[PDB]
Amino acid sequence: YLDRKLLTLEDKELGTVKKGYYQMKKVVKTVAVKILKNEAPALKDELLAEANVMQQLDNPYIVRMIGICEAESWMLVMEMAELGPLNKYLQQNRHVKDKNIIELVHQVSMGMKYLEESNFVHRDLAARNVLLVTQHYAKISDFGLSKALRADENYYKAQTHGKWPVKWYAPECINYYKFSSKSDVWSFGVLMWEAFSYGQKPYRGMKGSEVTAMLEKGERMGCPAGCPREMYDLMNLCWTYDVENRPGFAAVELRLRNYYYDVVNL
Numbered sequence: 001y002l003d004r005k006l007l008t009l010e011d012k013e014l015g016t017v018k019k020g021y022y023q024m025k026k027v028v029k030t031v032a033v034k035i036l037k038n039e040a041p042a043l044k045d046e047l048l049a050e051a052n053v054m055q056q057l058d059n060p061y062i063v064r065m066i067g068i069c070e071a072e073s074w075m076l077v078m079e080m081a082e083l084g085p086l087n088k089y090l091q092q093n094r095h096v097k098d099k100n101i102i103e104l105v106h107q108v109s110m111g112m113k114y115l116e117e118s119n120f121v122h123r124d125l126a127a128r129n130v131l132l133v134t135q136h137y138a139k140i141s142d143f144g145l146s147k148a149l150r151a152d153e154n155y156y157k158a159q160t161h162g163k164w165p166v167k168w169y170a171p172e173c174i175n176y177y178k179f180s181s182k183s184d185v186w187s188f189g190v191l192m193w194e195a196f197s198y199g200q201k202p203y204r205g206m207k208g209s210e211v212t213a214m215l216e217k218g219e220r221m222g223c224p225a226g227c228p229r230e231m232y233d234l235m236n237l238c239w240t241y242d243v244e245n246r247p248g249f250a251a252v253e254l255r256l257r258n259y260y261y262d263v264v265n266l
């Protein structure tokens with residue numbers, strides 16, 4: 001639990017997320033602060049659950065939580081990733097090249113390999129939830145929907161969902177509300193499609209029910225313009241319909257290593 005007197009917030013928004021500076025032992029640390037807007041119950045509990053997940057995670061490709069601050073509002077204080085969301089960055093930086101995008105999605109795969117090993121399911125793995133420290137260093141963010149798996153199960157059973165997250169959901173999430181590291185792999189495939197499409201939205205112009213129907217017919221998003229063929233092939237493997245045959249992150253990470261080195265050594 002952090003001291004509000006040592007935290008300064010900048011006025012404008014990145015409830016809300018604001019840039020701040022937290023006075024540590026001696027130096028200031030630049031932070032991003034998730035601030036809960038609560039004019040006037042369960043909103044507080046969601047923020048604390050998000051914090052509880054981040055507290056348990058320690059990996060270079062995951063956003064680090066500094067702590068929680070209880071003051072005028074409830075606040076989740078994190079280490080600042082200066083460049084912000086991957087989708088918005090790639091939208092505004094079309095100059096970014098194949099190898100660089102491959103480097104970044106590989107880093108995400110390394111963070112997700114760690115999450116998988118820790119038996120946590122992200123449940124919201126999308127390009128908007130990858131933050132850039134630098135142009136060559138990505139971290140996974142946004143653990144608000146994340147769940148610690150039971151010791152005796154490899155999935156979490158959710159309640160009925162709305163329309164907004166559907167485009168990143170695996171068929172078993174849609175049909176059975178079952179979330180696993182394998183469903184995170186499906187989402188990662190969509191994340192890759194986003195990244196190599198320079199932050200364009202997946203399944204443009206389609207409703208969730210239409211996406212679900214498309215996937216049930218055995219159809220998948222086409223190759224983004226200019227996207228390396230081997231990356232498109234990996235997306236399709238991530239979009240393996242049945243959970244058992246779909247790869248885990250260890251496998252996805254390994255195939256990202258090898259092609260990264262192929263591109264570096266071409």
Ligand SMILES: Cc1nn(-c2ccnc(Nc3ccc4c(cnn4C)c3)n2)cc1CN1CC(O)C1
Nearest residue numbers: 014032078079080081082083084085128129142
């Ligand atoms: C939970 C959370 N942490 N968090 C963080 C955590 C650490 N760093 C940053 N840095 C950062 C830097 C520049 C930014 C943004 C957003 N827009 N811009 C221009 C974020 N954000 C952001 C969020 C909100 N999610 C980011 C997803 O897009 C929504």
